[PDB]
UniProtKB/Swiss-Prot annotation, chain B:
S-S pairs: none
Keyword Transferase in record: yes
Entry protein name: SPbeta prophage-derived aminoglycoside N(3')-acetyltransferase-like protein YokD
Classification of source organism: Bacteria, Bacillati, Bacillota, Bacilli, Bacillales
Alphabetical GO biological process terms: response to antibiotic
Positions of transmembrane segments: none
Keywords, in A-Z order: Acyltransferase, Antibiotic resistance, Transferase
Protein's job: May contribute to antibiotic resistance.
Source species of the chain: Bacillus subtilis (strain 168)
Enzyme class: transferase
EC number of the protein: 2.3.1.-
Amino acid sequence: PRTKQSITEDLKALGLKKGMTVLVHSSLSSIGWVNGGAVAVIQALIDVVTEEGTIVMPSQSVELSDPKEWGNPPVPEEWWDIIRESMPAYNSNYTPTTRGMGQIVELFRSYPEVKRSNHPNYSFVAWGKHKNKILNQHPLEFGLGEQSPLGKLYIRESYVLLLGADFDSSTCFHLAEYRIPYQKIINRGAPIIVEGKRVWKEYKELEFREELFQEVGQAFEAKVGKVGSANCRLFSLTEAVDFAEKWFINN
Amino acid sequence: LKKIVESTTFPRTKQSITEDLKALGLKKGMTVLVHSSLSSIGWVNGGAVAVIQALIDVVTEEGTIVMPSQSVELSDPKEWGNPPVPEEWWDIIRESMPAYNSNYTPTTRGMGQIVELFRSYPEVKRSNHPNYSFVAWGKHKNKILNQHPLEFGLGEQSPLGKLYIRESYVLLLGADFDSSTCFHLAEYRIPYQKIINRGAPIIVEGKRVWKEYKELEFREELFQEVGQAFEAEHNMKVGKVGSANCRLFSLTEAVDFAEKWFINNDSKNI
């Protein structure tokens, strides 16, 4: 049976260190039965990194979008306007995370000390010393690019711990797309609270290409180890990003 | 979910759920214990948060909404069996089990998604029991969750003790009687009593400390029968909230009947 102690240990062996700054992606199952569930993995990462470090996690809520673009699953076209009209606004304090984000994030986002950026689709949660300066501002327009959290991390010596998670979800990559010659700008929409009032606001965002994210990560590796029974790759954010920029450009 | 979306005529919204709740019988200032099933409602735009707000919209800031937020997994591994765990692990398990914390210990899956989200919703409080905690929002959330002792704590002194004294209602939103936590309270007011020893991770003096306490060995398997008997002659509002079948009834009235059904069935029964 995996344990807090077990995991804390496992983590260091991988390379996590006190006072470090990491964006974490993860999967509870991939680790194999832990005595304590997600509260076991969280308390571990928290003991390794220490209050000197900074724990960061994506807490996306992409369901708060225009139903015209939904497809997993779709929804009758006759429901779009009524959906847009009655959709509850985003609120970092309670809007749940998309399912794909995983079980660790859903618990972490309401874990003591953790904070959440105010983006209605691409928010992040942080625990640590630099949680505020990394979430303070998060402009709706271009949720994850310069001025976003994944932007304020590129400027800090930061690492990306993939716990039981592949590269297909190394969100950081997204920053790079904001930095290459190719960029398809699109209007998106999300229910939001402006001046203490609900409003459906449209904004500009990039039409990402996340599929290429595995290929990019692939070529990026061309540390490692195991937390419980999960294949964990621990790299640096700044480097990880830079490569994508090059990968995309020359592609 | 594709099934949940395809079995739904039109989207269930905060407003349409608010309407159904009022038609059903839920009113302003009412204190109500809720047992839900988010899926039984049909696709709802906003999912759980939309259902929570509809509950708040109806019951108002003068009303009080309570929900059971049990974390039964924080128990002695021996009693486990869904699935069971190798005995060779029953010791490092009691040894390394994260202690219970009202601020983060995830509710047991069977409690529902709505309750899991409701527990960390702005202004919702949670009682201090490691297995049978409750969460409440509203006018009376403080006097209901306040006390919660480890021992028994689902009987007198637990929040059920506070929902019994002051007018309270139970709301089965897509759930049946087998989920009516209020009945457990009656089990502490009857002649029959099988007393078991339980254990759980807790924090005392600011240090984790595996503690053992006494508790009744509940017979929740009967609740479905108790509720169906209660329905023979007791007032109960029935009606749909979206595509889910619901019933709203008196908690005090339900507990009392449960007691009698139990008393006369273990004494008068063959």
